[PDB]
Design a protein around this ligand. Sequence first.
Ligand SMILES: [Zn+2]
Ligand SMILES: [Zn+2]
Ligand SMILES: [Zn+2]
Ligand SMILES: [Zn+2]
Lengths: 146, 135
Amino acid sequence: MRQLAKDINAFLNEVILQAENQHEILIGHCTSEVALTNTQEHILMLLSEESLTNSELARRLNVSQAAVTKAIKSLVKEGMLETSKDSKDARVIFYQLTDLARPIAEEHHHHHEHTLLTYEQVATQFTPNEQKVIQRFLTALVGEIK
Amino acid sequence: MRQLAKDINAFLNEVILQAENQHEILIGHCTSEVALTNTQEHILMLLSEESLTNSELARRLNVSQAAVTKAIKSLVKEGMLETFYQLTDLARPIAEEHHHHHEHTLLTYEQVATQFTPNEQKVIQRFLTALVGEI
Ligand SMILES: [Zn+2]
Ligand SMILES: [Zn+2]
Ligand SMILES: [Zn+2]
Ligand SMILES: [Zn+2]
C-alpha cells in the first residue's frame, strides 16, 4: 500500500479536527470587537448581500431551521439585525444589518478572503503543471467521498 | 487567483459536509444492521481492541470527553457496553463491521493514489502537508 493512502486518511482526520464542528474552516483568528458565533457572523455576511429567509440561510449554512431561528433571534436581540422595508427589495419585510453589524459582516468577509489567499499561497508553492496534478487528485478523491 | 485555491476551499467544505458531526470520513455505506452513530461504532471498534478510559478515547478520536461520554452512555443503554467498559456480544459484529469499513476506506485511497505516478504522489504528499501546515 502506497504511503499516500495513509496520508490521505490522516489528512482528512486533521481537516475534520480543524473544522472544530463549524460548518467551514477559516484561517487564523476572528478579529471582531463583538464575539458572535462563526455561524452568526456568516449569516451577517450573507444577509449583507441577499436578504435571505431563515429557511434559505439554513440550506446554505447546512444546519437546522431551529439553529438558524436561535441565531437570528439572538442577532435581533443583540441589535445586529432589525426588520425593514424598502424599494430595493421585493420582500414585504426582511431582516437587514444595523450599523453595529456592518463591521462584523465586513470582518467575516475579510476572513474568508484571507482564507482563500492562504490557499493561494499554498497553490503557488507548486508549478502550474503541478497544480494541475493536485487538481486532478482532489477531483478523484472527492468523487470517492461523495 | 489560482483556481486551485478555490478548489481547495470547495473541497474542504465537502469534507466537512460529508463528516456531519463525525470525527472521520469513511468510504461507502456502513453495512451494520444497527443504527448507531459513527462515533459509537468507532468507540466499539477501539474497545474491542483494548480497554481505554473515556479520557483516552477522547484523545484517540480527537473529540471532547463530553462527546465520548455521551456516546458511551447511549451504548450502555443500547446494550453494547457493560462494566473499564467492555463489549457485549451484541456489539462484536458491529466493531468488526466498522473495522472492515476502515479497511475498505484505506483500500479506496490506495486506488486513488495509484492513479498517479510515484513522482505525482510525492507532489500530492507535499501538497497535503503544506495545506495542513497553514490550517
Ligand atoms: Zn470574524
Ligand atoms: Zn463564513
Ligand atoms: Zn458501520
Ligand atoms: Zn472509525
